[model samples]
Target: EKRRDNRGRILKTGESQRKDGRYLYKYIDSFGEPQFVYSWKLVATDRVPAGKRDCISLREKIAELQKDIHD
Candidate 1:
C-alpha cells in the first residue's frame, strides 16, 4: 500500500512545512501499512521544471488504481 504518484513519487499526508522551509511526505507501504515518513521541502511553482505536468496524471492514475484495488 505504499502510496505513490504516477511517476512513482511517494505521496505524503498530514505533514507540514518546517521552519527551515521543508515538508514531509507520508504514505502506506505495500502491506497496507504506513512507513517512516520522510521530510521534504514545500515545493513552490519555481521549484518544478518549466515543462513538467505529470503530477495530475499521477494522482488520477493512483486514485483509479486504488479504487479498483480496494474494491
Candidate 2:
C-alpha cells in the first residue's frame, strides 16, 4: 500500500509528510548516499505555512532534482 500524508494525500515513492506538517523527499545521489529535502508546501500552488521561509514547493524541487540526477 502507498503511504499517505497527514492531509490524506498519497505520497509518491520517495515522498513523506512529517509530523510537523512539513513535506520531505528522499533520494540517493550519485555518490550513493541518501539525501533529504524539506518544504512546507507539497505543490506549486500550495501555501507555505505562516512564519515559514517561503520557497518553491516540494514537488517542484523533486522535479528539478530528478532532472539533475538523470542528466
Candidate 3:
C-alpha cells in the first residue's frame, strides 16, 4: 500500500493500480531487471519539457495503483 505525504509527494515502496483496471505492484522487480515493468506505458520524446511531462504522467499511473489497493 502507498500514499502521498503531507506535501503531496509520493511515498517510496508502495503499490498502485493502472488506468486499465489492472493491479500494479510497485516494488523492485527481479534482480538485474529494469526499473519499470514492461506493462508500464512509456512516453518517448526528444524535448526536455516533454520528459518532465512524462515524469508527471507517472503519478497518474501510481494513483491508479493506489486506488486499487484502497478501493
Candidate 4:
C-alpha cells in the first residue's frame, strides 16, 4: 500500500510530497544520478509543485536535459 505525506499527497516514484503538501520531482539515478541542471536544487513539474530553492515549469518533452547548463 502507498502512503501519503502530512499534506495528503501520495508519495510515489519520481516525486516527493513535502510537509506543506507540495510535491517535488524526485528521479531515479543511473549509477547514482540526481538529474540536477545547474545546482543540487530540485526540478519539479506542473502536475507537481516546487519546494523552496526549486524551479517549477512544464515539461514539453523529456528528450534531453543538462544541455543548457553546459553551454
Tens digits of per-residue lDDT, candidate 3, 1-71, equal 55753334453454354555222344333353434432232222212233333332344654554455444
Clashing pairs in 2: none
Write down the TM-score of every candidate. Answer: 0.32, 0.77, 0.23, 0.31
Worst window of 10 by summed lDDT in candidate 4: 58-67
What is residue 32's positional error in candidate 2, in angstroms? Answer: 2.1
Cα RMSDs, all models: 10.4, 1.9, 11.8, 7.0
Predictions in order: lDDT: 0.42, 0.81, 0.39, 0.40
* lDDT, ranked from best to worst: 2, 1, 4, 3
lDDT of 3 at 46: 18
Q: Is candidate 1 or candidate 2 better by TM-score?
A: 2
lDDT at 35, model 3 = 43
Candidates ranked by TM-score: 2, 1, 4, 3
lDDT winner, 3 or 4: 4
**lDDT by residue for model 2 over 1-71, one digit each (tens)?**
76788887777787877789999888767677888999888888788777888888877887787778866
- Tell me the RMSD of model 1 versus the true structure: 10.4
Estimate the TM-score for candidate 2: 0.77
lDDT of 3 at 13: 53
Give Cα distance to truth, residue 51, candidate 2, Å: 0.5
Worst 10 residues of 1 by lDDT: 37-46
Which ten residues in a row are the worst by lDDT in model 3? 38-47
